[PDB]
Enzyme design. Structure first.
Site, PDB file in Angstrom:
ATOM      1  N   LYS A 154       3.193   6.413   5.235  1.00 53.43           N
ATOM      2  CA  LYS A 154       2.224   5.506   4.632  1.00 53.43           C
ATOM      3  C   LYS A 154       2.726   4.081   4.786  1.00 53.43           C
ATOM      4  O   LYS A 154       3.834   3.764   4.349  1.00 53.43           O
ATOM      5  CB  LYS A 154       2.007   5.829   3.152  1.00 53.43           C
ATOM      6  CG  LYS A 154       1.029   4.865   2.473  1.00 53.43           C
ATOM      7  CD  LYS A 154      -0.421   5.115   2.890  1.00 53.43           C
ATOM      8  CE  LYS A 154      -1.335   3.936   2.572  1.00 53.43           C
ATOM      9  NZ  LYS A 154      -1.221   2.857   3.602  1.00 53.43           N
ATOM     10  N   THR A 155       1.917   3.236   5.414  1.00 55.84           N
ATOM     11  CA  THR A 155       2.271   1.838   5.637  1.00 55.84           C
ATOM     12  C   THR A 155       1.911   0.938   4.456  1.00 55.84           C
ATOM     13  O   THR A 155       1.109   1.304   3.585  1.00 55.84           O
ATOM     14  CB  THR A 155       1.555   1.280   6.869  1.00 55.84           C
ATOM     15  OG1 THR A 155       0.143   1.442   6.686  1.00 55.84           O
ATOM     16  CG2 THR A 155       1.966   2.011   8.121  1.00 55.84           C
ATOM     17  N   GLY A 156       2.485  -0.257   4.436  1.00 53.07           N
ATOM     18  CA  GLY A 156       2.014  -1.289   3.534  1.00 53.07           C
ATOM     19  C   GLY A 156       2.025  -2.620   4.235  1.00 53.07           C
ATOM     20  O   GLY A 156       2.882  -2.887   5.076  1.00 53.07           O
TER      21      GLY A 156
ATOM     22  N   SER B 175       0.777  -1.232   0.000  1.00 55.86           N
ATOM     23  CA  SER B 175       0.000   0.000   0.000  1.00 55.86           C
ATOM     24  C   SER B 175       0.811   1.285   0.000  1.00 55.86           C
ATOM     25  O   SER B 175       0.224   2.366  -0.091  1.00 55.86           O
ATOM     26  CB  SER B 175      -0.942   0.028   1.197  1.00 55.86           C
ATOM     27  OG  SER B 175      -1.997  -0.895   1.043  1.00 55.86           O
TER      28      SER B 175
HETATM   29  B1  LIG Z   1      -2.062  -2.124   2.065  1.00 50.41           B
HETATM   30  O1  LIG Z   1      -0.790  -2.868   1.836  1.00 50.41           O
HETATM   31  O2  LIG Z   1      -2.092  -1.432   3.390  1.00 50.41           O
HETATM   32  C1  LIG Z   1      -3.393  -2.923   1.711  1.00 50.41           C
HETATM   33  N1  LIG Z   1      -3.461  -4.038   2.643  1.00 50.41           N
HETATM   34  C2  LIG Z   1      -4.232  -5.063   2.483  1.00 50.41           C
HETATM   35  O3  LIG Z   1      -4.967  -5.200   1.585  1.00 50.41           O
HETATM   36  C3  LIG Z   1      -4.070  -6.136   3.410  1.00 50.41           C
HETATM   37  N2  LIG Z   1      -4.382  -6.044   4.608  1.00 50.41           N
HETATM   38  O4  LIG Z   1      -4.890  -5.075   5.165  1.00 50.41           O
HETATM   39  C4  LIG Z   1      -4.598  -4.766   6.520  1.00 50.41           C
HETATM   40  C5  LIG Z   1      -3.968  -5.955   7.270  1.00 50.41           C
HETATM   41  C6  LIG Z   1      -5.876  -4.333   7.174  1.00 50.41           C
HETATM   42  C7  LIG Z   1      -3.655  -3.600   6.646  1.00 50.41           C
HETATM   43  O5  LIG Z   1      -3.275  -3.403   7.808  1.00 50.41           O
HETATM   44  O6  LIG Z   1      -3.296  -2.959   5.619  1.00 50.41           O
HETATM   45  C8  LIG Z   1      -3.555  -7.344   2.870  1.00 50.41           C
HETATM   46  C9  LIG Z   1      -3.466  -8.396   3.722  1.00 50.41           C
HETATM   47  S1  LIG Z   1      -2.881  -9.702   2.915  1.00 50.41           S
HETATM   48  C10 LIG Z   1      -2.833  -8.831   1.502  1.00 50.41           C
HETATM   49  N3  LIG Z   1      -2.479  -9.448   0.505  1.00 50.41           N
HETATM   50  N4  LIG Z   1      -3.234  -7.575   1.574  1.00 50.41           N
END
Ligand SMILES: *[B]([O])([O])[C][N]C(=O)/C(=N\OC([C])([C])C([O])=O)C1=[C]SC([N])=N1
Length: 268
Positions: A213-215, A49
């Site tokens: 911004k986290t991912g 993300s």
């Molecule tokens: B991004 O990388 O923040 C989008 N993230 C996601 O779609 C996923 N999880 O979301 C949570 C765990 C809520 C988050 O904290 O961002 C994710 C989990 S497994 C995956 N392929 N994408």
């Protein structure tokens, strides 16, 4: 700071990488001097993300020439929702404004919001084109949410390098990639992030303000990018990518916080 302290920091990053299964990709840039602390800086990592920063910058750049764009409302339905859409799931039907979508995707990592903004721009290739326009030859957005998170070994789709993302974060948040007002809005949104309290923020001193911004991908993997604003010295850019696969979230977050702490120690 000093070269010797930066070399020591790089050794400490290598030691940190040995504490988990996987790779650490790290760049910190001290904007007072341009000094860099780097580990696997030119290796590609899935950005997950963290690309939503580049996405939102591209939207802001377009809004500089269209004063109504940020207030444009985009309708969508329940069938448009992809996994992890905590804000957009609340507003099915009439939808949300472009500004609200940017805030949601940056501060809560809302996936449907990202897809709506990607479509607004003309598709994922428009985000890649925007990256090129600000000097980033490395970034590539190939897919939409949630497929871009597959992180298949050797697959260069939806990846960048720590060096390229640090240079882009610097240009976007601290430098001249965007106009004044748009740079400020991107900073304001990322300063208000809700998802990163245990990552870069946890590794820097309490008085520092962090725009990040986290991912997060599969198997407890994670990353974080951003800028820290110390209260009386120059901003520091942080980019922390990993291929860590952890048993829990705390272990993953501790590695990212530790990596930031190592660079903060060297630069203060
Ligand atoms: B991004 O990388 O923040 C989008 N993230 C996601 O779609 C996923 N999880 O979301 C949570 C765990 C809520 C988050 O904290 O961002 C994710 C989990 S497994 C995956 N392929 N994408």
């Amino acid at each position: 700071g000093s070269h010797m302290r930066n070399v020591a920091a790089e050794q400490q990053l290598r030691e940190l990488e040995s504490t988990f299964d996987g790779r650490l990709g790290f760049v910190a840039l001290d904007t007072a001097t341009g000094a860099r602390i780097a580990h696997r800086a030119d290796e590609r990592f899935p950005f997950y993300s963290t690309f939503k920063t580049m996405l939102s910058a591209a939207v802001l750049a377009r809004s500089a020439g269209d004063a109504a764009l940020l207030q444009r409302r985009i309708p969508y339905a329940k069938r448009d929702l992809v996994r992890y859409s905590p804000i957009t799931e609340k507003h099915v039907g009439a939808g949300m404004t472009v500004a609200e979508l940017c805030a949601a995707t940056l501060q809560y990592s809302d996936n449907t919001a990202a897809n709506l903004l990607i479509a607004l721009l003309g598709g994922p290739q428009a985000v890649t084109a925007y990256a090129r326009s600000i000097g980033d030859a490395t970034f590539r957005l190939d897919r939409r949410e949630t497929e871009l998170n597959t992180a298949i070994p050797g697959d260069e789709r939806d990846t960048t390098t720590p060096a390229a993302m640090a240079a882009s974060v610097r240009r976007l948040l601290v430098g001249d990639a965007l106009g004044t007002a748009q740079r400020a809005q991107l900073n304001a949104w990322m300063l208000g992030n809700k998802t990163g309290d245990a990552r870069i923020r946890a590794g820097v001193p309490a008085g520092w303000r962090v725009a990040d911004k986290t991912g997060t991908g599969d198997y407890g993997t994670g990353n974080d990018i951003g800028v820290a604003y110390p209260p009386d010295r120059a901003p520091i850019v942080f980019v922390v990518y990993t291929t860590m696969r952890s048993r829990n979230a705390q272990a993953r977050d501790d590695v990212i916080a530790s990596a930031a702490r190592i660079a903060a120690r060297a630069f203060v």
